[PDB]
Design a protein around this ligand. Structure first.
Ligand SMILES: [Mg+2]
Ligand SMILES: [Mg+2]
Ligand SMILES: [Mg+2]
Ligand SMILES: [Mg+2]
Ligand SMILES: [Mg+2]
Ligand SMILES: [Mg+2]
Lengths: 68, 248, 72, 69
């Protein structure tokens, strides 16, 4: 189906194109996924309140890094 | 140096910067983009503070301590006067195989080659010592806000017949010549050369002031040659400043 | 059940997605709240981890912020 | 619950991946999933923030290497 509301009808998961899901909260498009990526939209953040890991032969790529 | 695996707190500790791009600059990492693994084993330049006046400085102690820092560059802030322990060795020597990326001298005091020893009898005075021998070229950088001085030559010795006397030591701290008869030249001080032995119109030469040869004796034994301020290869002159003796 | 009426059960009755309040979703597995999202953020709860087995990317004018960084 | 939540069509959405495990899927590529301790992607599948990417609190970031543009 095209739209999965989770509680309120501005919030949940919806079709975002072929093989694409949008993650939505109070009408804001927070992020989504496709066959290769889970992502946030511009200016929307990803926060781990545990560890944040990259395992395997890949890497972390960023613009800049702040270590407190 | 930055060490893994905790590269993050290690670079914060080494560089003082939380932002990786600015930590990279402290580690002299110029690639952009850069892999943070390239921080490992690199160090921010080290800054040494010398406020101990030292009239017996040994160039080999400094070489050893520089080599202990490996490739890390070293800045030395010299805030107290320094004199080589002997005129036969420069105060500072920077061998061509030093590993440090660069060495900076920030000179805020007077640094000197040692004065040369006064000659005795028919011998000339001995040469003043050199201040800096530089064999790493532009990897030595000098910010002279004080004085860099080659040592004065020792005075020429005196002899006529059986009378033998000694010349004065070159500035700084050059030894007066000690003759077989204890007709000796004066040791120099830090601030002035030593007087040769004198008897009326007869005398052994006085020591030379910094950067100058010793005086000839009344018997025409020549003074020792002037010590030199900087010898060997040209450093990068951040500030030339006040220099006694030749440099390059 | 433990996910309640404003929930999407996936597999079993205590795994899936649960409303957290207006504009909030909880990501739940075996009744543990692993993480969630709201209008500004996707996140994990305290002590719950985010792991990429590919690349982990920050694109654009923001940045990566952390307490420490371990490089193997 | 459901074995599968179809989003768009039956090849894209969320699936049961085991006991307390969910698969995140798109055109039947298994992109990632979650369990009671972790949200994760599968091998070679990426997580990308187009805002900030944060590790907040007493944990840490663990990686193989990190590239700063
Ligand atoms: Mg609405
Ligand atoms: Mg779009
Ligand atoms: Mg609303
Ligand atoms: Mg000047
Ligand atoms: Mg269960
Ligand atoms: Mg299809």
């Amino acid at each position: 189906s095209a739209s999965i509301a989770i509680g309120d009808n501005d919030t949940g998961l919806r079709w975002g194109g072929d093989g694409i899901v949008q993650i939505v909260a109070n009408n804001a498009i927070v992020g989504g996924w496709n066959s290769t990526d889970i992502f946030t939209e511009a200016g929307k953040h990803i926060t781990s309140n545990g560890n944040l890991n990259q395992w395997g032969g890949g890497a972390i790529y960023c613009r800049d890094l702040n270590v407190s | 140096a930055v060490q893994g695996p905790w590269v993050g707190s290690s670079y914060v500790a080494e560089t003082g910067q939380n932002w990786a791009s600015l930590a990279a600059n402290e580690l002299r990492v110029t690639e952009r983009p850069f892999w943070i693994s390239s921080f490992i084993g690199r160090s921010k330049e080290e800054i040494w503070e010398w406020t101990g006046e030292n009239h017996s400085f040994n160039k080999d102690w400094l070489i050893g301590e520089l080599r202990n820092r490996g490739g890390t560059p070293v800045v030395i802030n010299i805030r107290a006067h320094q004199v080589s322990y002997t005129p036969g060795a420069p105060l500072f020597e920077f061998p061509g195989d030093l590993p440090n990326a660069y060495i900076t001298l920030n000179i805020y005091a007077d640094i000197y080659g040692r004065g040369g020893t006064g000659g005795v009898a028919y011998l000339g005075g001995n040469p003043g010592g050199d201040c800096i021998h530089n064999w790493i070229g532009n990897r030595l950088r000098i910010n002279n806000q004080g004085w860099i001085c080659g040592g004065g030559g020792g005075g020429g010795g005196f002899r006529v017949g059986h009378t033998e006397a000694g010349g004065g030591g070159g500035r700084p701290l050059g030894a007066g010549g000690v003759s077989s008869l204890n007709l000796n030249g004066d040791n120099a001080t830090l601030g002035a050369p030593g007087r040769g032995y004198q008897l009326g119109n007869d005398y052994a030469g006085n020591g030379g002031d910094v950067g100058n040869p010793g005086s000839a004796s009344s018997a025409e034994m020549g003074g020792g040659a002037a010590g030199r301020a900087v010898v060997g290869t040209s450093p990068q002159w951040i500030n030339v400043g006040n220099i006694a003796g030749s440099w390059l």
